[PDB]
Amino acid sequence: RGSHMMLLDVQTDSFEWLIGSPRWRESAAERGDVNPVGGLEEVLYELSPIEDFSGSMSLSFSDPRFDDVKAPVDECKDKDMTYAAPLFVTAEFINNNTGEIKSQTVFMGDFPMMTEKGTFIINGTERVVVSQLVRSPGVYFDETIDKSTDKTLHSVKVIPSRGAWLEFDVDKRDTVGVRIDRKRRQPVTVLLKALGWTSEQIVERFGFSEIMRSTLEKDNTVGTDEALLDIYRKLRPGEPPTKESAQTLLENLFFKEKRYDLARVGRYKVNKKLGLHVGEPITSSTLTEEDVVATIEYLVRLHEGQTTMTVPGGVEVPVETDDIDHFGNRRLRTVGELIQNQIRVGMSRMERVVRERMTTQDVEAITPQTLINIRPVVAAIKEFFG
Amino acid sequence: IFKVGDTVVYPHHGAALVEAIETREQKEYLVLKVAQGDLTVRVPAENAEYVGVRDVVGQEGLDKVFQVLRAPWSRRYKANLEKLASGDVNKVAEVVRDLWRRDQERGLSAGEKRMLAKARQILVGELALAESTDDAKAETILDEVLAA
Numbered sequence: 001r002g003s004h005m006m007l008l009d010v011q012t013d014s015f016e017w018l019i020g021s022p023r024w025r026e027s028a029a030e031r032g033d034v035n036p037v038g039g040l041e042e043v044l045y046e047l048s049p050i051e052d053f054s055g056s057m058s059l060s061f062s063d064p065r066f067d068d069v070k071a072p073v074d075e076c077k078d079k080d081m082t083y084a085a086p087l088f089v090t091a092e093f094i095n096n097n098t099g100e101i102k103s104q105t106v107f108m109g110d111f112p113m114m115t116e117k118g119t120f121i122i123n124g125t126e127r128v129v130v131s132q133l134v135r136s137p138g139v140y141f142d143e144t145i146d147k148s149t150d151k152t153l154h155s156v157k158v159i160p161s162r163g164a165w166l167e168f169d170v171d172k173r174d175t176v177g178v179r180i181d182r183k184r185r186q187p188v189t190v191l192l193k194a195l196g197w198t199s200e201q202i203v204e205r206f207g208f209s210e211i212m213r214s215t216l217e218k219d220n221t222v223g224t225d226e227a228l229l230d231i232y233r234k235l236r237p238g239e240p241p242t243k244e245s246a247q248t249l250l251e252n253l254f255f256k257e258k259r260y261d262l263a264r265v266g267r268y269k270v271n272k273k274l275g276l277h278v279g280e281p282i283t284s285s286t287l288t289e290e291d292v293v294a295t296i297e298y299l300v301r302l303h304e305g306q307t308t309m310t311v312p313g314g315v316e317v318p319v320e321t322d323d324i325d326h327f328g329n330r331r332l333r334t335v336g337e338l339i340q341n342q343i344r345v346g347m348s349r350m351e352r353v354v355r356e357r358m359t360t361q362d363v364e365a366i367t368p369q370t371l372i373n374i375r376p377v378v379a380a381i382k383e384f385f386g
Numbered sequence: 387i388f389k390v391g392d393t394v395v396y397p398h399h400g401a402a403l404v405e406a407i408e409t410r411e412q413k414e415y416l417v418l419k420v421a422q423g424d425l426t427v428r429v430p431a432e433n434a435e436y437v438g439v440r441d442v443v444g445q446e447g448l449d450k451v452f453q454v455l456r457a458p459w460s461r462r463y464k465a466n467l468e469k470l471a472s473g474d475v476n477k478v479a480e481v482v483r484d485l486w487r488r489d490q491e492r493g494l495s496a497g498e499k500r501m502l503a504k505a506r507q508i509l510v511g512e513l514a515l516a517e518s519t520d521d522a523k524a525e526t527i528l529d530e531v532l533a534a
Contacts, residue, residue: 100428103426103427103428364397364437365398369423
């Protein structure tokens with residue numbers, strides 16, 4: 001849902017943050033912000049490094065910056081042009097075998113710039129981007145009725161401030177599934193195994209549950225390594241899954257600050273809902289293995305109509321659905337954030353082309369320029385402002 | 387053996403300018419600039435041969451080397467010790483020149499004859515590559531440069 005009223009300065013400030021401008025940077029310094037990071041800068045950090053198969057080579061990105069706008073606002077209006085500045089990044093390829101470090105400045109596309117008015121000029125026409133209201137970070141459980149089995153179904157979403165989604169559900173076949181980063185549904189035990197759980201510990205913890213026993217048996221995965229590869233096959237279909245890269249991908253998905261952030265309030269709400277770390281200061285806002293396991297147990301106990309639970313070392317909490325019409329469960333997404341998310345999608349596709357080119361290119365010939373295709377980044381921006 | 391301002395061929399990239407020699411757990415790094423694609427390449431000096439990068443003395447350098455070979459004590463020993471160390475063909479040249487001229491007259495110490503014989507080894511190895519010949523006619527060029 002788009003906003004019905006916007007605060008202008010919130011939006012213009014969000015854009016300055018996105019492009020990491022001098023005035024955003026100085027304002028951060030004045031507030032005494034700890035480690036100020038711009039929007040584009042954060043995206044580049046999120047994907048660095050891109051490693052090949054064997055962890056020999058890597059490509060990293062840094063220092064997003066702009067040349068001057070191609071043309072004045074009036075001229076863009078009078079000649080029907082797009083008011084924009086060329087975006088550049090520094091890209092660095094490293095061969096771990098030889099210790100070669102090969103770096104160059106890479107053009108990433110012309111980037112539409114916001115005006116004094118908080119507008120963009122796109123092919124001559126002045127336009128306003130509208131912010132959006134989205135669900136705030138937290139863990140949300142829901143109950144529905146199937147059409148048509150007459151069965152009562154349950155599901156849960158873990159929503160961060162920044163990063164991939166994590167969803168669990170009990171379907172009409174009475175199996176527990178996981179959807180990682182909105183991908184295809186997998187038996188939930190595949191995720192447990194991927195995190196290092198043996199069949200024995202899964203049964204110790206979840207053996208009370210009929211649907212969990214049934215899920216484990218019908219789970220066609222044998223061992224942690226197989227589980228890791230299957231998640232890789234789901235997240236990166238068509239690419240050669242390896243152990244080490246599957247570990248890194250899953251680790252970075254949820255459990256490290258690089259690509260995932262519940263933020264302090266989301267971290268608080270997850271603790272509260274699940275009954276974890278009750279008298280403790282919030283330090284990190286990443287997800288933990290403990291969170292994942294307690295979320296599954298919550299969903300499963302909810303399904304069997306239980307009303308309380310206590311995780312190992314935690315405190316008792318009520319087991320119930322979240323009304324999820326409540327305010328506080330809605331959150332503002334600024335224009336800078338919307339553009340930031342769009343860039344991220346473009347880069348992720350660029351990121352995939354890099355991995356694919358790493359499989360075939362001669363390592364001794366590789367530079368950032370031979371690996372980097374900016375078309376999906378350019379296309380993502382074009383789509384956004386159309 | 388890599389000097390700032392020299393140009394070297396970097397396979398797959400082309401002509402690279404030696405722009406600097408850094409120190410970067412801590413070893414010696416070549417900073418190379420390929421104008422083609424404005425590419426910066428940093429590579430550990432010891433690894434340069436593996437990657438197919440060689441600094442071969444160009445015509446500018448051959449002149450200088452021959453110019454210095456023709457140009458007109460614990461202190462002197464340690465200076466020359468230091469020149470052989472630097473792997474700079476111009477320094478080696480100075481060592482060869484000074485020791486050889488002394489060997490024609492007063493004669494050298496056993497230690498110095500060893501220093502001279504080694505400096506020549508280094509120098510003809512470098513000359514051989516520079517005149518694209520192979521270690522037989524290089525020394526001959528050296529002697530004639532020396533005799534004259």
